[PDB]
Amino acid sequence: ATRFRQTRRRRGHVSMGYGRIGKHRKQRGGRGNAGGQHHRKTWFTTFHPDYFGKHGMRVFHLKANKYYCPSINVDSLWSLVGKDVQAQYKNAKVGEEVPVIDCVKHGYFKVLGKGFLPKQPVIVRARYFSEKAQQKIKAVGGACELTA
Amino acid sequence: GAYKYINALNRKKQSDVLRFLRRIRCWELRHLPRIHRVARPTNPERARRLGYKPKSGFVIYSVRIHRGNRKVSARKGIVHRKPACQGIHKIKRVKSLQAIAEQRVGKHCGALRVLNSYFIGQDSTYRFFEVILVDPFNAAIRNDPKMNWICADKQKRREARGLTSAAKKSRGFTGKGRRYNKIGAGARGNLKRRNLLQLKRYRS
Amino acid sequence: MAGIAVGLKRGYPVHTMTAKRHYGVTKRKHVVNDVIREACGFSAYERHMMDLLRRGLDKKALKYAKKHLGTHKRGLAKRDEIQRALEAI
Amino acid sequence: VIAHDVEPLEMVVYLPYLCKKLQVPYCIVKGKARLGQLIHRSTAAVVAV
Amino acid sequence: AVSNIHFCKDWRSKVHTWFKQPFRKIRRHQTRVEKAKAVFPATIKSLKPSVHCMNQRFNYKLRLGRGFTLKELRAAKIDKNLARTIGIAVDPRRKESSKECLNRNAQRLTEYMNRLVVLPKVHAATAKRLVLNKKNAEAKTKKAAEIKKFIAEHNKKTKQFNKLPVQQKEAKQVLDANKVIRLTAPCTLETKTLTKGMKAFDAVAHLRKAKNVAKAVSGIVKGQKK
RNA sequence: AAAGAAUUUAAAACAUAUUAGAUUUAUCUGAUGUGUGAGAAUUUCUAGUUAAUCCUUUAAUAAUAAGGCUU
RNA sequence: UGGAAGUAUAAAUCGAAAAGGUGAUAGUAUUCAUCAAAGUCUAAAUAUUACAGGAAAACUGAUAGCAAAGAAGUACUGUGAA
RNA sequence: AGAUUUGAGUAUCGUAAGAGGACUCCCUUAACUUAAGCAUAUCAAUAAGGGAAGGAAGAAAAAAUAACAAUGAUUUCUUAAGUAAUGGCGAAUGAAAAAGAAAAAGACCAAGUUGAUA
């Protein structure tokens, strides 16, 4: 909407809101991130204090697929099957039939332990487990299964 | 098979027998004109591998080329360039001497098609190749279902576009994979595709 | 039920299935090699390598071969190939 | 029987050395055109018995 | 935020606009229709395997591959020479990855071969195959008796190749065979019985034992040479 | 010392034996055969012993080399 | 070249094979995996602001729109490129 | 004399040249500019110079990826991704496998064998 810009409101003003003592000239200190260590050092120190330097080891060819590991906490496990199934198997214990949560089928590899689980037995099938994740699943009456 | 021994023999180029024969051939080609037709290939094993067939329409041409390196063609070695580009010596041609010699033969014989070429010998000054040429308008070549691909229009001056094996190697088509990421289907075409700024019709 | 995703015994349980085909040569290559070697002989560096091997400088024969071939494994083969020529002679 | 004037010589040079290994008798005569008259051709690189 | 904008080169000659996009649909769709009218079996987009994706990030998913291996055709009793003529993709470059891949893609070929209806090479009713079927039809009936029996009672040498299903039927022209034979059956909620052993299985220790075993091979080799 | 069922049918690599051919050279080429590799223990823990032990070189290790982290 | 103890090409020298190449940190060894270079061809999906023929347009409406809405690359200038 | 090899003249039937080069495949070591100076770097396979093509061209059937519950010629689009990496590690430059689609197609020489050989 060019009719809502500031240019339409500054017609008749000589400098178009840019100053008379200091004009609107071509440059204001260099093109791009110029002068990162001479006259814009106070900008990089103030707002990007670790911009210049090196840190860590180079990975010549990083295989980004080997670091892929989606995570889900324990409190969010039941949302995979919904509250309808959760209430159905609310009154189960050892011996009878218990729902299985397939984290891998939903795209989750590692199960972390955060928050609180409902007080029902459940079987959790996944690729990795945290120490506190297995504790919270076992403390509620469930079992942990590995995959892949 | 006779040609399984010639191929094994031809791999011993540093033997006394092959060194002496190459000396005579290299001497002979130093006096004959630069580009001239020979009756039959001097290396029939290597000629047969590269597509030569002893039939009508297949001819062999010998070409002598001055090997080594050359200076950058600037007058008196003076260039008005930054010190990064101020080199006159030590600069090497991108195209191989085989590809360069194939273009000289093809330019000389504009009505024939360069099939392939191989190496004959060399000395302190020259290097001698041999170019397999095919006449695309021969009745035998046209009627051969296995060879009339050379009669297509697009094969006019094969060597000058970079379709022969000698000229394709200088284009980077010597292998596949991560080593040849920049020469996928043409080095210059690959660069254009990657640098394209695609502006979809509906964009954020 | 499913395997495990970490360690040596890693992977989903399946029955993985190829043949390490050897790219070799027939028994006639010995005849062809003998025929060509008689008609051609040895190069300058093969001749220099035979002389070093005769004096018992096996390590110097490998260092010389590596210089003229550029590969440690290719230098070993040439050293063994040349020393087999000496034993026949 | 091997002709002495075969060009290039790289095509029949191994024949004396191959026949020497297999104990096959071999002789070298003069003229590939002389051999060719036997088999009714202009030239003949080699002829066996 | 520090800006990283690569417009210093002449982007104006690098700009590609998509004004031809609404007409690619019309071109491709019309050509796709034209091929169907020419030989409708051709546009069927010949059947393809069910191969897993690569890498552990995707390895639990199935996707169509290119071509059945020569072992999968043998398992399904199809000639590799006739396979390409009846809309089957064949990939000799594919090494058989596992027995499960071999079995799963053998069902795909067998199921496709049952839905296949190959028309006679010559439309005339005097074609040899149609005549041949009549000549040996009496042998088929007695053959179909004993096969129907030892199947009905039970529930090492077999035919190398099966028969091509050849007959005369109405042309029900189906544009592709991959969407008729689904890769994966719909996934229901799996559910299991809780046992005492399941409660006791310690998953974390198994993960760390498996990991720590892999990291102690160096300690084994280093101490060996000493 | 204390808890532990482990998931279920279409198979090739060849370590090889034993034969049917050919070969003399660093000798090879088929087929018959069994296991391998097969599935209807494993972990924790206390006391020893041995070994390894700051991270990485992306198929696994090793001694050299190189790169990381702190000063 | 993004390819970093050398990703690709070329030149000088050197130069293999009872094969071997690759697994991007140089080196040697032992396993493992995966291919089999140094000859050729091959439709379809893709590009197009030469040029020709058409159709459209929240484009310009004779100082605008192509330089050119008339005998426009014309009148006119320059030795000439222009 | 005769049998061959090689090289020429002439005759017949043909073939290349020039125009165009928007898109296509290449050769060549520009500079202005940016770095608030500048000398590597950037501009930049960019301008100019040169060659060769067709209605499309180039590429194309693994000495290819990966380390998986594995894929499988080429080409083009989406994503990976302003990411790994490169860089007076400054200014700046910068991919690819996996994965989702359009389309799908595989065949030959050489070498080997058959030689009352054609």
From Swiss-Prot, chain A:
GO terms for biological process: translation. Keywords: Cytoplasm, Endoplasmic reticulum, Ribonucleoprotein, Ribosomal protein. Component of the large ribosomal subunit. The ribosome is a large ribonucleoprotein complex responsible for the synthesis of proteins in the cell. Its main location: cytoplasm. It is found in: Cytoplasm, Cytosol; Cytoplasm; Endoplasmic reticulum. Pfam families: Ribosomal_L27A. It comes from Entamoeba histolytica (strain ATCC 30459 / HM-1:IMSS / ABRM). GO terms for cellular component: cytosolic large ribosomal subunit; endoplasmic reticulum. Disulfide bonds: none annotated. This is Large ribosomal subunit protein uL15A. One of its GO terms (molecular function) is structural constituent of ribosome.
